[PDB]
């Protein structure tokens, strides 16, 4: 079954967020987690896996990947995987068996795909149609290496372009009032709200939690649409 599209006033309005949009922006800017062909070095609680990935900027960080249930964590525990996603640091707490903010320790949700058998020869393009106030003025594509790809990765790549080229998120507020990204595969679709919840704080953790289902799409099938409205 296919997720019905956003109802009247179901979408978060950026005008009702009064904190710094910077906190959303840094999730969809260049910094992100991407590791190829790694295996988890520890579990954490029931739903979580810890990975060691290269920092590049000293040597090794720990990423706490959190899924929405134990079946997901059990599945990938002992597999070689690719990890891709939006990571955070503030109020990122975990150990390998309320604590200081640690640059070598970061958190995310989902973003995990089997490595073996998932690699394409070529990078594949997936076209994105953007609607501003219902008009499709802008069309581009995002690229992936993966037969099976997390919606999270595609979401990240899409927004990253919109950040760079349409200023989707700025330091204080967005030029868009509402925004959702919609993924279509055959005649089945689902969408994410691109805007923070109302009020004066943005909880990065709570927002990213939507990726914890590890939702995947076929890169050969999927289409992407973005509906934005202006202020």
């Amino acid at each position, epitope marked *: 079954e296919s997720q019905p599209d956003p109802k009247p006033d179901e979408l978060h309005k950026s005008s009702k967020f009064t904190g710094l949009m910077e906190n959303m922006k840094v999730l969809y800017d260049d910094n992100h987690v991407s590791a190829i062909n790694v295996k988890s070095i520890d579990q954490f609680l029931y739903f979580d896996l810890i990975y060691s990935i290269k920092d590049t900027k000293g040597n090794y960080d720990n990423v706490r990947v959190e899924f929405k249930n134990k079946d997901l964590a059990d599945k990938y525990k002992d597999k070689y995987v690719d990890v891709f996603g939006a990571n955070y640091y503030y109020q990122c707490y975990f150990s390998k068996k309320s604590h200081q*903010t640690d640059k070598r320790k970061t958190c995310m949700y989902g973003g995990v795909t089997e490595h073996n058998g998932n690699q394409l020869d070529k990078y594949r393009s997936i076209t994105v149609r953007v609607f501003e106030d219902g008009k499709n003025l802008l069309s581009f594509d995002v690229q992936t290496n993966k037969k099976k790809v997390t919606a999270q990765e595609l979401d990240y790549l899409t927004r990253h372009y919109l950040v760079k080229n349409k200023k989707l998120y700025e*330091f204080n507020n967005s030029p868009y009032e509402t925004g959702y990204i919609k993924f279509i595969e055959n005649e089945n679709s689902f969408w994410y709200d691109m805007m923070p919840a109302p009020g004066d704080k943005f909880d990065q953790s709570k927002y990213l939690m939507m990726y914890n289902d590890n939702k995947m799409v076929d890169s050969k099938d999927v289409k992407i649409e973005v509906y934005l409205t202006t202020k």
Partner: nanobody
Amino acid sequence: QVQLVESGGGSVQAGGSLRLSCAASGSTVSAYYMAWFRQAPGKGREGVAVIGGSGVYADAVKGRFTISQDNAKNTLYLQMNSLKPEDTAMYYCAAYWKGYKYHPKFDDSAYEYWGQGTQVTVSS
């Protein structure tokens, strides 16, 4: 990692202006999210301005104060116009590392480094 030293505090008759400076050593200010706070006698420390976009300002100082950041002098500035008695306070510069992918805005308790501050006194 970053050490902050304020200067420029003094007394000013209402309606005049004043510019505060905060020099930084040990790290480039571009690596930190910089902010100005102030603490009037008989009140908590409160946010004045943060660096980013074209600057984000407390309502109380909107239109009167300007924050800026000179990267090559590794210095922050607070330009204060139309000073009023209410603006009397100890003024503080603060820094939070950008590598945490989080901006505390005016949550003073989150910031990692502070300057000693400077007295601004506005006589009516």
